[PDB]
Each structure stands twice: as structure tokens, then as C-alpha cells.
């Protein structure tokens, strides 16, 4: 029996389904969700939420369009910040502390996210950051401590490289990976409140990955997720979403390693990219569907909720109490990687909320980056031409 199977039965008995639609494929963050959404399910005398997988993040919010389109939207979303900037155009959704939901101890920067023209529209749910993924065994066999910084992780991934023949440094040529390149060297998406994709450091980022392609270090992963690819060739860091953490683990045919981002220098970490959702609420939705919401996300912001939840997953616990939650210390006791995730998520940069920025990140940044690393793309000219197509998007 499927933590789904249970859910269907929940709802069919209910007087109230408020339907919550997600992006979660499988794996522990489907598993997560659901197992959260029964025990909810189970305290409440006939009102349910009703989790429906749209496919990935960019079929829900394609589905939530078509939603609009027909004019029937689902009481709940997981949602982006620009998906929350696209909805807010639309006026499609409910302030969340008009609803009664008391947000006092979230991290404020989770909170600062969902914030627009000072309302907060979203609850940060599943919020994820970039952690360096890394192959202990290796590293330990060629006596290679893990990086702290980005001269040490290029020095480490050449080394590494030569020593294994073949490219250690695993990466997906896509938006989220050029981010971290992006962020820790130096570089902004916004100058003076405009766009920017062309700027020095981005064609620095760009021009990094294409020379670690060229130079045997760097690996571009062009099929699945890297942790789908594990197994094929030497192993021995990536950059990757915090989420990622339980696929790395039942993948990986050695001791996996997590550690903070290399930084610039040893000061500090690098920044992380964040990733995840805020669940928002629809406006469209009946009183009853919204009250429903209203205890759900109080029960998603418990210590509890987000301690199992965070704990399965590798995502990010939004809240202080959650870190004061004995599961939570009990985890983090045995596993030193959860101390790892909270950490790096203390070093966490946000791409732009620009309503545009869904379509911009795949269809012309991330377009960008294949051209360069795929089809040896000059990283200028690569750019260049997403910075235009951008600039006619948003004009
Ligand atoms: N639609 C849309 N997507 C966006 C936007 N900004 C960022 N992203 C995507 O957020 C994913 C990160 O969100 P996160 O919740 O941290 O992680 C995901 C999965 O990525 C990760 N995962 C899943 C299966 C697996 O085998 N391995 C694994 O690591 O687990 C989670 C739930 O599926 C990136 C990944 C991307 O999908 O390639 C493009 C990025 C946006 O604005 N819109
Ligand atoms: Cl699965
Ligand atoms: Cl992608």
C-alpha cells in the first residue's frame, strides 16, 4: 500500500480535498510529501489534501497555466519565486498571513524570497541549496583533501583526472551548475535593476566549464541527472542540489561525501545556489479548500513536519524550531551531512524573481550553456546571443 493508495482513500471519505500540485517525479521527496499529507490527512475529521504529481517543476507550472487558461485552479502549488512573480500578475494568489498562517521563525531569507511589495504569497516548503557532492574513497586513495576553494577544487579535479584517466568533475550544462561558477565568481544577474546573462563573470563561468571540457577535468552530463550516470567512469565531485543527497546515496557504488561549496578563499564557503518551492494558495479556491490550506501549512511549518521532512530528503528545515526538533538532533547526531546542508544553506544565493525568468533559464541561458559546452559555443558569443533573445523577451 502506496502512501498515495492511502491518500486517494483519505479524500474519498472527505467533505473537503483542497488539491496541493507538485513537481516531485518520486524518490524521497514524493515519498516525503505523501507521508506528510496521510498524517495531516489522519488529524483532520474529514478534510484532506490531495497531493497530485504534475510531472518535474516545469510541467506543473506549464499545467498551472493551462489552469488559468480554464479557469479551475487547484487550492495548492509548489511554486518558484518568478512562478510566484507570474502568478501575482494573474492576481491568482492568497496572501498567506491574511489566511492565518504565522510564519515567525522562518529563516528569514526563505521568507524575504516569498515577499513581494511586502506581502508574503508563499510558505517555503522544500528548499534545497547546492552542496559539493564528492567521492571519499577517491579522494582518500590519491590523498586529496576535499577543496575549500575553487583554485583547490580545479587543482584537485586535474589531479584527479589525470591520476583516474578521465574527467572527475561531473556537471550538467545547465543554469543551476553555471550559478555556482556564476555567484562565486563575483557575478550578479542584475545591474541597475537590469538583466544581465553577458556579463564578464558570466563568460568567466562559462569559459571555466568549457576549459575544464577541453583540459579532460570536467564532465558534461547531457542524459539524466548525475546521480543516473554514477557508475560510468571516475567519480569525484559534483555540485548539486542538497535534494539530490538520498539519489546520490542509493546510487553510489562508493563512501558518498558531502562538504560546503569551495569558496574564493578559505574565509568561507562559496555561495549555493537555492532551489525547492513555497507552496501558495489560489485565490480561486472555496473558503473551506482554504482553511484547509491555512492547517496544512501550519502543519508543514511544525518542528516536526519539517525535521522528517528535511531529514528524508536532504532539503533544507525552513524554520528555527525544526533545528530544536529531537528527530531532527537525532538524525543529525548519526549524519553528519545534515549539518552540512544547514550550513552551506547559511552561504545561499536566489536567482531572479522576474516572471519571465522560467523561460529564460531553460530556453536561453540554459541554451547558452549547452551551445559553449556541447557545440563549443564561443562563451561570449554564446551569451551575447542569450543576453539579446532575454532583452527581446522581456521588451
Ligand atoms: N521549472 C522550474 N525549475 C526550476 C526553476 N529554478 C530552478 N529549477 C529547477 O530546480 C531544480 C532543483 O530543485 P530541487 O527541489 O532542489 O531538486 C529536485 C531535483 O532536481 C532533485 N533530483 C530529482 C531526481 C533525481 O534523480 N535527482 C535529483 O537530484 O530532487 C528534487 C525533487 O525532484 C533544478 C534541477 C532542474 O530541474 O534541472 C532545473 C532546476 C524554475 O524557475 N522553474
Ligand atoms: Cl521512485
Ligand atoms: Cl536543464
Known amino acids: 500500500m502506496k502512501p498515495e493508495d492511502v491518500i486517494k482513500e483519505q479524500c474519498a471519505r472527505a467533505k473537503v480535498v483542497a488539491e496541493l500540485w507538485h513537481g516531485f517525479t518520486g524518490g ?21 489534501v490531495r497531493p497530485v504529481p504534475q510531472g518535474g517543476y516545469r510541467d506543473l507550472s506549464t499545467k498551472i497555466k493551462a489552469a488559468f487558461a480554464a479557469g479551475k485552479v487547484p487550492t495548492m502549488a509548489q511554486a518558484f519565486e518568478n512562478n510566484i512573480a507570474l502568478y501575482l500578475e494573474a492576481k491568482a494568489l492568497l496572501p498567506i498571513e491574511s489566511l492565518g498562517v504565522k510564519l515567525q521563525g522562518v529563516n528569514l531569507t526563505f521568507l524575504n524570497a516569498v515577499r513581494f511589495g511586502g506581502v508574503v504569497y508563499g510558505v517555503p516548503f522544500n528548499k534545497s541549496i547546492q552542496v559539493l557532492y564528492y567521492n571519499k574513497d577517491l579522494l ?24 583516474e584517466g578521465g574527467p572527475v568533475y561531473w556537471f550538467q550544462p545547465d543554469a543551476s551548475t553555471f550559478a555556482y561558477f556564476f555567484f562565486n565568481l563575483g557575478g550578479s544577474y542584475l545591474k541597475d535593476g537590469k538583466l544581465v546573462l553577458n556579463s564578464k563573470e558570466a563568460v568567466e563561468a562559462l569559459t571555466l566549464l568549457q576549459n575544464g ?8 552530463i547531457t542524459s539524466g541527472y548525475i546521480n543516473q550516470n554514477l557508475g560510468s567512469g571516475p567519480y569525484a565531485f559534483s555540485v548539486d542540489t542538497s535534494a539530490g543527497y538520498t539519489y546520490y546515496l542509493r546510487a553510489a557504488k562508493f563512501d558518498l561525501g558531502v562538504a560546503t561549496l569551495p569558496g574564493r578563499t578559505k574565509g568561507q564557503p562559496g555561495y549555493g545556489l537555492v532551489a525547492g518551492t513555497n ?29 522528517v521532512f528535511a531529514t528524508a530528503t536532504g532539503y533544507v528545515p525552513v524554520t528555527e524550531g525544526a533545528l530544536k526538533d529531537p528527530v531532527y538532533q537525532a538524525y543529525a547526531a548519526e549524519n553528519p ?44 558569443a554564446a551569451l551575447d546571443r542569450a543576453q539579446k533573445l532575454a532583452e527581446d523577451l522581456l521588451s
Open 213 to 220: 571540457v577541453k583540459e579532460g577535468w570536467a564532465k558534461p
Open 337 to 380: 551531512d545534515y549539518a552540512t546542508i544547514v550550513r552551506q544553506s547559511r552561504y545561499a544565493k536566489f536567482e531572479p524573481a522576474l516572471a519571465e525568468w522560467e523561460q529564460i533559464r531553460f530556453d536561453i541561458l540554459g541554451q547558452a550553456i549547452k551551445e559553449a559546452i556541447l557545440n563549443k559555443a564561443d562563451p561570449k
Open 279 to 307: 507552496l501558495v494558495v489560489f485565490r480561486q479556491a472555496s473558503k473551506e479548500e482554504q482553511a484547509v490550506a491555512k492547517d496544512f501549512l501550519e502543519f508543514v511549518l511544525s518542528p516536526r513536519a519539517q525535521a
Open 28 to 48: 524521497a521527496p514524493k515519498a516525503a510529501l505523501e507521508n506528510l499529507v496521510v498524517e495531516f490527512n489522519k488529524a483532520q475529521q474529514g478534510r484532506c
Open 140 to 163: 582518500k586513495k590519491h590523498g586529496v583533501p576535499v577543496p575549500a576553494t575553487l583554485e583547490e577544487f580545479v587543482a584537485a579535479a586535474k589531479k584527479l583526472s589525470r591520476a
